[PDB]
Amino acid sequence: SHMSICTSEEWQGLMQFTLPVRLCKEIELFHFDIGPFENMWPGIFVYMVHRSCGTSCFELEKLCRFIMSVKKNYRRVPYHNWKHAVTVAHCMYAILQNNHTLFTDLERKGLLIACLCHDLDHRGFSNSYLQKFDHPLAALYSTSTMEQHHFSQTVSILQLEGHNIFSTLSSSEYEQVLEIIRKAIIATDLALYFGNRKQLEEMYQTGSLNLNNQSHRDRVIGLMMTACALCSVTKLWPVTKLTANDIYAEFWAEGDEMKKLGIQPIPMMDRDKKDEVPQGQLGFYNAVAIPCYTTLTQILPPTEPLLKACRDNLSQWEKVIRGEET
Ligand SMILES: [Mg+2]
């Protein structure tokens, strides 16, 4: 399937990697920023998998090959890259650690892997772009185009020799974890978030939400995936601000291509309309981020720190709009 594969030096190096003692405590916190520790990113993921799922959950050799090959199949784009993948996986780790027994062993291992793989082989182009210009991917995947591709990429990596970390699961559990991963990755398509959140909010307010109901579990997991995928808005302001720079760098490049195809891009993707960014961020926080973390906190009380951090960043964008930026 034209997948990149890690080298022996790469996965063997990870196998011997040891995570500094000081970071063990930091990694448990919601606001942890992996940014200053690039060389340790693969190791941080191994650590989280081991703490959440156990050191024997996966054959170590296979897990290290899987991780280093996943890294190699993320592209050098400004935002939807390897750093983003590990950042999202860490948010999931923090959510799971704080709500551990609400999720099964199968779900925790599937969700950590889904987060690491949720944007696999992203090229820096949105579903809007692929569908507007009839990219082959849009023909193959009519909706949630890039997300269906990310899942396909995930399965392709598992299919590489010695990379299938899930093979030791019974045939029933194997099928189940692949479905958990497929649904989780598809849920990262923000187009689906709006309806999912509205539904969950109503089930919560009316008291019909039932975690013993599979469809309800699927929706809760979907909201968790959205929360993790957007977690840059829950970091300390300087981190959130720096990440916004990368997000827009990617958007502006897409907008440049649209102009070449004769189409005016939306203002958010127009590098000649940067003055509109602060209000654009306000709109995103009000329509997507705040409601997401608000409903997540209602369903999973321990995730409240994400909501508090999101609210703090909304306030920061409001300060920018008032001309108080430093
Ligand atoms: Mg995505």
Side-chain angles (χ1 to χ4, degrees):
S1 303
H2 297 61
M3 305 301 287
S4 295
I5 308 171
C6 67
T7 65
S8 59
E9 191 190 70
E10 281 170 354
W11 64 262
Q12 289 176 173
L14 180 56
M15 283 191 84
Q16 310 177 314
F17 177 77
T18 304
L19 183 71
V21 179
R22 271 183 171 176
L23 296 186
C24 293
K25 185 178 181 188
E26 305 293 62
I27 297 177
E28 301 299 319
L29 307 177
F30 283 115
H31 63 274
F32 181 65
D33 174 25
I34 68 171
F37 317 101
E38 192 172 323
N39 73 123
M40 311 179 196
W41 294 348
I44 283 173
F45 187 71
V46 172
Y47 180 85
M48 295 188 297
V49 171
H50 286 178
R51 299 303 294 169
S52 181
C53 316
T55 55
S56 294
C57 174
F58 300 125
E59 295 176 59
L60 187 58
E61 191 176 62
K62 293 181 177 182
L63 176 63
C64 290
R65 292 196 193 83
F66 181 84
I67 292 165
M68 299 309 288
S69 287
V70 165
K71 176 179 180 296
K72 207 166 180 176
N73 284 277
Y74 265 95
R75 305 194 174 194
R76 294 191 166 180
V77 292
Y79 178 67
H80 291 101
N81 50 40
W82 171 240
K83 181 180 183 190
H84 170 71
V86 181
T87 295
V88 175
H90 165 269
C91 188
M92 179 59 76
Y93 173 73
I95 293 177
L96 293 176
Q97 286 289 81
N98 280 283
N99 299 276
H100 200 262
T101 55
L102 198 59
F103 302 95
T104 68
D105 297 336
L106 204 55
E107 291 172 328
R108 297 198 314 280
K109 71 184 74 176
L111 292 180
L112 288 169
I113 292 294
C115 284
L116 193 76
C117 299
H118 85 287
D119 274 320
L120 265 172
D121 191 44
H122 201 292
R123 304 84 179 288
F125 293 88
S126 72
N127 281 338
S128 291
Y129 185 93
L130 294 175
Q131 291 177 23
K132 294 174 195 169
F133 301 108
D134 294 341
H135 186 280
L137 286 171
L140 183 58
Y141 307 124
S142 64
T143 66
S144 300
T145 304
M146 282 306 305
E147 296 74 31
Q148 293 200 240
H149 180 62
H150 303 312
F151 177 64
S152 180
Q153 288 282 293
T154 301
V155 175
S156 295
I157 294 188
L158 288 167
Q159 296 180 316
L160 296 174
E161 179 179 59
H163 286 60
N164 203 327
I165 59 180
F166 294 123
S167 294
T168 51
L169 293 175
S170 69
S171 64
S172 181
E173 286 199 346
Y174 184 83
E175 290 170 339
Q176 289 171 46
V177 81
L178 272 174
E179 271 300 279
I180 287 168
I181 294 170
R182 184 187 64 73
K183 295 170 179 177
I185 292 179
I186 293 296
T188 63
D189 171 8
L190 284 171
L192 300 178
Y193 154 76
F194 300 98
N196 190 223
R197 190 263 173 180
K198 181 164 63 177
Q199 283 289 295
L200 282 174
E201 181 60 24
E202 191 56 43
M203 298 174 156
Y204 172 73
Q205 296 299 344
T206 65
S208 69
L209 186 61
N210 178 191
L211 282 294
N212 298 314
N213 180 144
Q214 188 66 50
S215 66
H216 286 25
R217 289 190 81 76
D218 289 349
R219 288 187 175 276
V220 170
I221 287 170
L223 188 64
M224 286 161 56
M225 291 297 297
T226 303
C228 295
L230 302 176
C231 83
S232 77
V233 304
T234 65
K235 304 306 181 182
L236 293 186
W237 172 241
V239 177
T240 295
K241 191 171 191 183
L242 284 178
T243 300
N245 294 334
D246 300 338
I247 291 173
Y248 278 86
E250 199 169 295
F251 287 146
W252 295 329
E254 173 173 329
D256 290 345
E257 294 308 314
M258 293 180 67
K259 296 176 178 187
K260 296 178 189 173
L261 296 168
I263 306 303
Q264 189 64 56
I266 57 177
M268 188 188 84
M269 298 186 189
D270 197 331
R271 67 174 69 253
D272 288 328
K273 293 182 175 180
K274 301 185 176 186
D275 295 342
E276 295 190 36
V277 171
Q279 191 69 211
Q281 286 291 293
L282 240 201
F284 185 78
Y285 277 71
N286 290 323
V288 183
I290 294 288
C292 175
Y293 296 109
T294 296
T295 301
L296 187 67
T297 295
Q298 293 166 353
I299 297 172
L300 306 176
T303 64
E304 191 173 318
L306 295 174
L307 173 57
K308 286 182 169 184
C310 185
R311 285 177 174 155
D312 287 344
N313 284 320
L314 171 54
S315 291
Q316 288 301 300
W317 280 112
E318 289 175 323
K319 281 178 59 285
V320 172
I321 292 172
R322 289 197 300 281
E324 294 174 41
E325 175 177 67
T326 56

